[PDB]
Amino acid sequence: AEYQNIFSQVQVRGPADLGMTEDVNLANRSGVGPFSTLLGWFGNAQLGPIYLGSLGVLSLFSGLMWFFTIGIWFWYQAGWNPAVFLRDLFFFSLEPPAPEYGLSFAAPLKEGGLWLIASFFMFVAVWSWWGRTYLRAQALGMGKHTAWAFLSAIWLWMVLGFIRPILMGSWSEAVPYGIFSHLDWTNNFSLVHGNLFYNPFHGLSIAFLYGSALLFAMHGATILAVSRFGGERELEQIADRGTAAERAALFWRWTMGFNATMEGIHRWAIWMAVLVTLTGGIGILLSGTVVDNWYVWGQNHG
Amino acid sequence: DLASLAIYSFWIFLAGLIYYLQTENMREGYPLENEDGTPAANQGPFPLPKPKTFILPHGRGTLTVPGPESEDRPIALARTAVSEGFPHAPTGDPMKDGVGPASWVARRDLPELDGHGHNKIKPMKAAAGFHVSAGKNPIGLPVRGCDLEIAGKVVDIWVDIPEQMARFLEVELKDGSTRLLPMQMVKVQSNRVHVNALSSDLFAGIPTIKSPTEVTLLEEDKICGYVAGGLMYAAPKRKS
Amino acid sequence: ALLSFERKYRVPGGTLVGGNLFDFWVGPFYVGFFGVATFFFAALGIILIAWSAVLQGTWNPQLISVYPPALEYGLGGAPLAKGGLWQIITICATGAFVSWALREVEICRKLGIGYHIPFAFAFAILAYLTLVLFRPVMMGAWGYAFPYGIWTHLDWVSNTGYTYGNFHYNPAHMIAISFFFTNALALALHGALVLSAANPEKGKEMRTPDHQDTFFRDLVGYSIGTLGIHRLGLLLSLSAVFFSALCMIITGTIWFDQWVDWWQWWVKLPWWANIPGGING
Ligand code: BCL
Ligand code: BCL
Ligand code: BCL
Ligand SMILES: CC[C@H]1c2cc3[nH]c4c(c3C)C(=O)[C@H](C(=O)OC)c4c3nc(cc4[nH]c(cc(n2)[C@@H]1C)c(C(C)=O)c4C)[C@@H](C)[C@@H]3CCC(=O)OC/C=C(\C)CCC[C@@H](C)CCC[C@H](C)CCCC(C)C
Ligand SMILES: CC[C@H]1c2cc3[nH]c4c(c3C)C(=O)[C@H](C(=O)OC)c4c3nc(cc4[nH]c(cc(n2)[C@@H]1C)c(C(C)=O)c4C)[C@@H](C)[C@@H]3CCC(=O)OC/C=C(\C)CCC[C@H](C)CCC[C@H](C)CCCC(C)C
Ligand SMILES: COC(C)(C)C(=O)C/C=C(\C)CC/C=C(\C)CC/C=C(\C)CCCC/C(C)=C/CC[C@H](C)CC/C=C(\C)CCC=C(C)C
Ligand SMILES: CCCCCCCCCCCC[N+](C)(C)[O-]
Ligand SMILES: CCCCCCCCCCCC[N+](C)(C)[O-]
Ligand SMILES: [Fe+3]
C-alpha cells in the first residue's frame, strides 16, 4: 500500500525554534522545552517556549484557585479519606446556593458560598485568558479571529452560570461543579423546559455541531489527499494557487456542484464551529426567561 | 413573541452569511468558462465579490483577487465529442505535457521563504544542525519503482526548516544526476525506498531544478504533478 | 460551465466500472457509473417515501414519517404499509450512500489524489448502518431502528435514550461527546488561525506559518503544526463518530439496564466498597 500521511515515516530535528519576534516582549517568553518524538510522529515535536506575562499569571493563578476551591470541597465531602475520595470522585458536587438566597452573596459557605468563590475565580480566570488570546495576536500583528471565535464559546458559558441565573433571580439556577452532577443538571434542565428537542436553537446548535464534524472531516481528508502537492501549506497556496488548491476545489465541484477556495474553506470553518455555541447560548437564554416549555411554544409559536 | 422574533431573525442572518461565505469562495477560477475559454453565459445567482489585495511578505509584491485569470502554459488536450461535458484526450504524452492527474500550475518561479526571509525548504546537507531524530534514515537506501527495478539512491533529504519536516527525498539516478521525490509518495522500508507511482524508466522524466540548493513553487508543482500522474499513466508498467 | 483552470483536469479515465461509458460530466457534476447508480437509488427511495406519505394521508413534511416494522415481525419481511416500505427505503439509502462513496473514489483517481475523503465518509455510512442494520439484527427486529421522519426520528432518539435511564451515563457516549466538543474546538481554532495570518492587522503583510506556530506556543506552549492540525481534525471527527457507533451497538445488546447503574462496578471495588462516609457510604 500507498503511504497515507496520517503518521510521519521519518523525523527530522534542528535547533529549537524560538519563533518570530515582531512586537512581542521577548523577556516574557520562556525557554524551549524538550522534544516529544511521540508527538513528533503526529505533528511538531518541539515543546515550548511559552509566553508568561501578567495576564497569563493572573489567569493561570485564578485557574488553579478555582480548581482547588472545588477540590477541598470534594475532600471535605470524602471525609478526608483518600479511599472514599477515589471511590466517590464523580459523585461529589459543589452546588450553587439555595433558591432562598436569590442573587445574594451572603449564602453560608457550606450552603453555596463556596460555589460563588469558585465561580468568581473561574470568571477572572476565563476573561483574563480571553484578553490573553487577543494580546498574543496583537503582538504578532495578526487578525483577532481567535479572540472573537473564543468569545462565542464564552457566550454559552456566560449564559449558563451568570446571565441566566441573574435574569431568573437566583444563583440556584446555575450549573454545579461536579462530573455526574452537571450531567444531571443538563438532563433535568430539558425536562423542566418541556424537552429541549423542541427548542429550535438547540436543534440549530446540533446541526452546527454535527456539521463541524462533517466539515473538519471534509477539510482534513482533503488537505491530506493533496498533501502530495504541498496542500498543508495553505498560506502560500492562498497567495499563489498551486495544483493542490485546484485538485482540492475540483474534487468537490465534481462531487457536489460547488466549491471553496483555500482562504474560503477556512471561513466556512470558523463560522460552522462558532455558530454551535452562538445559537446554543441563545436557545438556553430564552429557556425559562421568555419560554417556560418548548413543546407548548412549539404548538403555537408564541 | 421574543423567541419567534429571535429565530426568524436568525434564519435571515444565516442566509446573508451563506451569501457572504459563497461569494468569498468565488475569488479564484471565476468567472466560469466554456471548454473553448470564452466566458460562460450563466455564472449562477452570485456576483463576483469586490476584489481584495494581499500584501506578500519580503517585498514580493501584492496579489489581488478576483483578478485576470490565465493558465500561462499550453494545454495539450483535444476534445473527444461534439458537445459539452466529455473528457479531453491528451494529444501527446500527458506526463511530459503536464495535463490530467499530471497537471501543474504556473506558480511563481521563486522559493517559499520562511518568516525571516530565508528559503523555507533546504537539502539537509545545507541545513546547519538538522538530523534524522527518529525512524529509518532513508539516506543511502536504493530507490525501487513500481516495476520492482532499482532507479537510484537517496543521497539527501530536503527538510522544511521552520516546521522541521521531511518534504522530499533527493535521488541519485544511474547517470549521476538527481531528482526530488515528494515525501508523501514514497514508502521508506528497512532496506529500500519504494515508489508505487513511477516505474524505474520514468524517474529520468521527473523535472529538474535549476539550482542544486533550492526549489521554486513552480518546480514543486511540476514535480509533484509529474509523480502523481504516474499513478494513472505508469499503470501499464506497474505489476504486483 | 468550467472553472478557469478546470479543462486540463478533465481527461478520460479513473473509472472503476464500465470504462468510458459513463466517463463524463453534467454541468459541474461528474457522473461515472456510480453517478448513475446513486441517481437510480435516490429516485426510487424518494418515490417510495412519497408512496408512504399517501398511505399516511399527509403531504406535510413535518408530519411525514416512515416507520420500521413492529417488533412482532422480528427480522422478517413486513407488509408495505406495515413496515416493508421502510425496509426497501433503507435498502435504497444504503445503495445511495455506498454508491456516492464509490463515485468519490472514481473522482479521486481521475484527479490523482489520495482516498482520505471517501475513507472518512465511510464512517458516517457505518454509523447509519449501525442504527438501522447492525443493532436491530443483533437485537432481533427491524423494529429497533429509527423511523424516517423529521421529528419522529428525534422522538426515537429521546425514547431510546430514556429507556436506559439518563443516557449521559453510557460510558462510550461520554467519550464520543468529548470528541464532538473537542473537534468543534479544534475547527474553531484552525479556521481562526489561518484567517488571522492571511488577514492581519490593517496595512500589514500577510503573516507566515512561522507566525502561526509562534502564536500558539506563546498561547499554550505548543503547536501541533500545519500538517498536524489537518491530521488532528480528520481523527477527532472520525473518532467522534466511531465512539458514537460503539455506544449504541453495545446498548440493548450487552447492556440493557440503566446506564447509571453500570458505574456501581467502580464504587463497589472491595478495597473501598465498605468504607463509610462520602456519597455512597
Ligand atoms: C446521528 C444522531 C441521531 C440523530 C439525532 C438528531 C438530533 C438530536 C437532531 C437531529 C437533527 C437533524 N437530523 Mg438527525 N439523527 C440521526 C440520523 C439522521 C439521518 C440519518 C440518515 O442517519 C439524517 C439524514 C439526519 C438528518 C437530520 C436533519 C433533519 C437535522 C439537521 C442535521 C444536520 O445539520 O447535520 C449536519 C449536516 C449538514 C449541515 C449537511 C446538510 C444536511 C441537510 C440538512 C440534510 C437534510 C436531509 C433531510 C431534509 C432529509 C432528506 C432525505 C430525502 C432525500 C428527502 N439525522 C440519528 C438517529 N438529528 C437536528 C434537528 O434540528 O432536526 C430535527 C437535531 O436537533
Ligand atoms: C437530557 C439532555 C437534553 C439536552 C440538554 C442540553 C442542555 C441543558 C444544553 C445542551 C447543549 C447542547 N446540546 Mg443538548 N440535550 C439533549 C440531547 C442532545 C443531543 C442528542 C440527543 O443527540 C445532542 C447531539 C445534543 C447536543 C448539544 C450541543 C449542540 C449543545 C452544546 C454545544 C457545545 O459544544 O457546548 C460545549 C461548550 C461549552 C460549554 C462552552 C464553555 C467554554 C468555556 C469558556 C470553557 C472553559 C474551560 C474551564 C475554565 C476549565 C478549563 C479546562 C481545563 C484546563 C482542562 N443535545 C437532551 C434533549 N443540551 C447546550 C445548549 O447550547 O443548548 C441549546 C446546553 O446548555
Ligand atoms: C434523550 C437523549 C439522550 C441521548 C440519546 C442518544 C441516542 C439514543 C443516540 C445518541 C447519539 C449521539 N449522541 Mg446522545 N443523548 C443525549 C444527549 C447528548 C448530548 C447532550 C449534550 O446531552 C450530546 C453532545 C450527545 C451527542 C451524541 C453523539 C455522540 C451521537 C450523535 C451523533 C452521531 O451518532 O453521528 C452519527 C452519524 C450519522 C448516523 C449520520 C449518517 C449520515 C449518512 C451516512 C448520510 C446522510 C445522507 C442524507 C440522506 C443526505 C440527504 C440528501 C441531501 C442532498 C442533503 N448526546 C441524551 C442523554 N444519543 C446517537 C448515536 O450515537 O448513534 C450511533 C444515538 O443513536
Ligand atoms: C466555538 C465553540 C467551541 C470552542 C472554541 C474555543 N475554545 C477556546 C478557544 C476557542 C476558539 C480559544 O481560543 C481558547 C484556547 O486558548 O484554546 C487553545 C479556548 C479554550 N477552551 C477550553 C476548554 C473548552 N472549550 C470547550 C468548548 C468549545 N470551545 C466549543 C465547542 C469545552 C467544552 C466543555 O466543550 C471546554 C472544556 C480551554 C482549553 C481554552 C480556554 C482556557 C482558559 O480559559 O483557561 C482559564 C483557566 C486556566 C488557566 C485553568 C487551568 C487549570 C487546570 C491546571 C486544572 C486541571 C488540571 C488537570 C487535572 C490537568 C491534566 C490534563 C491531562 C490531559 C494531561
Ligand atoms: C464521519 C464524520 C462526519 C461526516 C463526514 C462526512 N460526511 C460526508 C462526507 C464526509 C467525509 C462526504 O464526503 C460526503 C459529502 O459529499 O459531503 C459534502 C458526506 C455527506 N454527509 C451528508 C449528510 C450528513 N452527514 C452527517 C454526519 C457526518 N458526516 C459525521 C458527523 C449528517 C448528520 C445527521 O450528522 C448528515 C445529515 C451528505 C450532505 C453528504 C452525503 C450525500 C449523499 O450520500 O448523497 C447520496 C444520497 C442522496 C442524494 C439522497 C438519498 C435519498 C434516500 C434514498 C432516501 C432518504 C432516506 C433517509 C434515510 C431519510 C432520513 C430522514 C431524516 C429526517 C432522518
Ligand atoms: C487532588 O486533590 C486536590 C485538592 C489537590 C485537587 O486540586 C483536586 C481537585 C478536583 C477534584 C477538582 C474537580 C473539579 C471538577 C469536577 C470541575 C467540573 C467543572 C464543570 C463540570 C463545570 C461545568 C459547568 C460550569 C459552568 C457553566 C460555570 C459557569 C461559571 C460562570 C459563568 C461564572 C459566573 C460568576 C459568578 C456567579 C460570580 C460573579 C461575581 C462577580 C463580582 C462578577
Ligand atoms: C454553515 C451553513 C450550513 C448550515 C446548515 C443549515 C441547515 C440546518 C437545518 C436544521 C433544521 C432546524 N430547525 C430549526 C427546524 O430545528
Ligand atoms: C448547508 C450547506 C448548503 C450549501 C449552500 C449552497 C451553495 C450553492 C452554491 C452554488 C454555486 C453555483 N456555481 C456558481 C458554482 O455554479
Ligand atoms: Fe486548513
UniProtKB/Swiss-Prot annotation, chain A:
It is a multi-pass membrane protein. GO terms for cellular component: plasma membrane light-harvesting complex; plasma membrane-derived chromatophore membrane. The lineage of its organism: Bacteria, Pseudomonadati, Pseudomonadota, Alphaproteobacteria, Rhodobacterales. Belongs to the reaction center PufL/M/PsbA/D family. It is found in: Cellular chromatophore membrane. Fe cation binds at residues 219, 234, 266. Coiled coil: none annotated. PROSITE patterns: REACTION_CENTER (PS00244). Keywords: Bacteriochlorophyll, Chlorophyll, Chromophore, Electron transport, Iron, Magnesium, Membrane, Metal-binding, Photosynthesis, Reaction center, Transmembrane, Transmembrane helix, Transport. Disulfide bonds: none annotated. (7R,8Z)-bacteriochlorophyll b binds at residues 182, 202. One of its GO terms (biological process) is photosynthetic electron transport in photosystem II. Reaction center is composed of four bacteriochlorophylls, two bacteriopheophytins, two ubiquinones, one iron, and three highly hydrophobic polypeptide chains (designated L, M, and H). The chain crosses the membrane at residues 53-79, 110-139, 142-167, 197-225, 259-285. One of its GO terms (molecular function) is bacteriochlorophyll binding. The keyword Iron applies. It comes from Cereibacter sphaeroides. This is Reaction center protein M chain. A ubiquinone binds at residue 252.
From Swiss-Prot, chain B:
One of its GO terms (biological process) is photosynthesis, light reaction. One of its GO terms (molecular function) is bacteriochlorophyll binding. InterPro entries: Bac_photo_RC_H_C, Photo_RC_H, Photo_RC_H_N, Photo_RC_H_N_sf, PRC-brl_dom, PRC_barrel-like_sf. Disulfide bonds: none annotated. It is found in: Cellular chromatophore membrane. Binds 4 bacteriochlorophylls per trimer. It is a single-pass membrane protein. Keywords: Bacteriochlorophyll, Chlorophyll, Chromophore, Electron transport, Membrane, Photosynthesis, Reaction center, Transmembrane, Transmembrane helix, Transport. Pfam families: PRC, PRCH. GO terms for cellular component: plasma membrane light-harvesting complex; plasma membrane-derived chromatophore membrane. Its cofactor is a bacteriochlorophyll; a bacteriopheophytin; Fe cation; Mg(2+). The chain crosses the membrane at residues 2-21. Residues 22-240 are cytoplasmic. The reaction center is a membrane-bound complex that mediates the initial photochemical event in the electron transfer process of photosynthesis. Belongs to the reaction center PuhA family. Heterotrimer composed of subunits L, M, and H. This is Reaction center protein H chain. It comes from Cereibacter sphaeroides (Rhodobacter sphaeroides).
Swiss-Prot record, chain C:
GO terms for molecular function: bacteriochlorophyll binding; electron transporter, transferring electrons within the cyclic electron transport pathway of photosynthesis activity; metal ion binding. A ubiquinone binds at residue 216. Keywords: Bacteriochlorophyll, Chlorophyll, Chromophore, Electron transport, Iron, Magnesium, Membrane, Metal-binding, Photosynthesis, Reaction center, Transmembrane, Transmembrane helix, Transport. PROSITE patterns: REACTION_CENTER. The keyword Metal-binding applies. It is a multi-pass membrane protein. GO terms for biological process: photosynthetic electron transport in photosystem II. Fe cation binds at residues 190, 230. SUPFAM superfamilies: Bacterial photosystem II reaction centre, L and M subunits (SSF81483). Residues 56-82, 139-170, 251-281 are periplasmic. It comes from the Bacteria. The chain crosses the membrane at residues 32-55, 83-111, 116-138, 171-198, 225-250. One of its GO terms (cellular component) is plasma membrane light-harvesting complex. Reaction center is composed of four bacteriochlorophylls, two bacteriopheophytins, two ubiquinones, one iron, and three highly hydrophobic polypeptide chains (designated L, M, and H). Belongs to the reaction center PufL/M/PsbA/D family. The reaction center is a membrane-bound complex that mediates the initial photochemical event in the electron transfer process of photosynthesis. This is Reaction center protein L chain. It comes from Cereibacter sphaeroides.
